[PDB]
């Protein structure tokens, strides 16, 4: 929902952590031109859990969407944004011609034409150093054997669909070493007391009758056990109340 996205050579990245990863709210936007996922499945993405999510946001020119993919090669892929060979995530792209275009030409977006070497995975390089095509120096201005590093996009509303500005958001889901923290929503049916039902409070799988009791736990304690290492009571994570766990009959 951002009002302005950065250029492809200066793509801005945001870190997502310590929250409920509800990916279903993404579908409320415009129909996505590309929703290719690698490794992960968009159908059950909310079921899995990850550690950190890198949201790479940038705008490219139409057909350049096919260049953002693990193992691709091109102008943008080698000098503006390079994905790793084992990327695990989804690439979301949609058209934004009605926003990132102006009749006089929206030259606010630029891209790096070339560099001396290819970019590393997730590497960012912003600079105004004039490229030295020849052995002669290129100080001051770009002479005959010199060229500017950045080039500007046109992004006029009259261009074809292959040249329209497309906002692309790349999400990363690699778990490096840390335990996962963003799993998403896990809603379920409400409580049912005075009847033997199966319970799974925070992973405590079992079967028993839930009933209220005066055994108020400590503010940091979650469940209780007896001398036989058997779970006797547990708190409701929705509304904090101690409920005993006893076999029905």
């Amino acid at each position, epitope marked *: 929902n951002a009002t302005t996205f950065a250029s492809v050579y200066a793509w801005n990245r945001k870190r997502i952590s310590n929250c409920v990863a509800d990916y279903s709210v993404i579908y409320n936007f415009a129909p996505f031109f590309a929703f290719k996922c690698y490794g992960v499945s968009p159908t059950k993405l909310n079921d899995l859990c990850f550690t950190n999510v890198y949201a790479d946001s940038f705008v490219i020119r139409g057909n350049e969407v096919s260049q953002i993919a693990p193992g691709q090669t091109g102008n943008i892929a080698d000098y503006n944004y390079k994905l790793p060979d084992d990327f695990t995530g989804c690439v979301i792209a949609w058209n934004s*011609n009605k926003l990132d275009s102006k009749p006089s030409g929206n030259y606010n977006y630029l891209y790096r034409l070339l560099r001396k070497s290819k970019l590393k995975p997730f590497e960012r390089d912003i600079s105004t150093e004039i490229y030295q095509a020849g052995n002669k120096p290129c100080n001051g201005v770009a002479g005959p054997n010199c060229y500017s590093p950045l080039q500007s996009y046109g992004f006029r509303p009259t261009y074809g669909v292959g040249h329209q500005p497309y906002r692309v958001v790349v999400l990363s889901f690699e778990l490096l070493h840390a335990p996962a923290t963003v799993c998403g929503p896990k809603k379920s049916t409400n409580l049912v007391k005075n009847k033997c039902v199966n319970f799974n409070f925070n992973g405590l799988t079992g079967t028993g009758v839930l009933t209220e009791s005066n055994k108020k736990f400590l503010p940091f304690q979650q469940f209780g056990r007896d001398i036989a290492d058997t779970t006797d009571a547990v708190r409701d994570p929705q509304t904090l109340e101690i409920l005993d766990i006893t076999p029905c009959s």
Partner: antibody
Amino acid sequence: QVQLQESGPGLVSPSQTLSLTCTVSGGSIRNEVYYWSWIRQPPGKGLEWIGYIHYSGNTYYNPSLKSRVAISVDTSKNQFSLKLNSVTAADTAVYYCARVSVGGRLVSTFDYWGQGTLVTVAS
Amino acid sequence: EFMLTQPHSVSESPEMTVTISCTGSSGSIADNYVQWYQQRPGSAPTTVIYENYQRPSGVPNRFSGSIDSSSNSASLTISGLKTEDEADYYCQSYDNSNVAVFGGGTQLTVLG
């Protein structure tokens, strides 16, 4: 060949909301032309551009008819409709739907047109 | 706004060189591609010239367009007009704000 079929009530009372439905035959609107526009023509007069809609939600309208023209699309039925609120006698024209080719460098190539239909603005 | 002006009526003897002109008023013609469409009475318009120099299949070679940036106008010259080409012609262009505009129309008439 790709054929279009206009549809809708041929008689609309004044000061009402006009509605016409155009049916696309021969494929689906994902990659074919990326654009489908409406064009009206008064009896004995010249053509008049209304606006096209993209399957991603991009809409463009005529500056003279911005607040009156409303365009929608349905990818499940492969049909796009044109809506016109508060119609009068001046809206007497034969409406056509046509596809616009955007695969080139610029928007152009109105290659196919529909059969067309007239809407009576009198009751 | 980019309005196009066309002569309302025109007529010429068959097998002669005819040229239909269409001029812009409030925009540069070289910014967008000008298209020409032939619309017979009681039928839908048919694409005649696209990309200002390209002609689709089935259209006779008599049709040929031209662009003049000096006079910000376009001209559709015909070589060897005949009765089968007697129909209306329109110049279609696009405004700088992605707004398509159709011309005023040109009524062609065959006297022969």
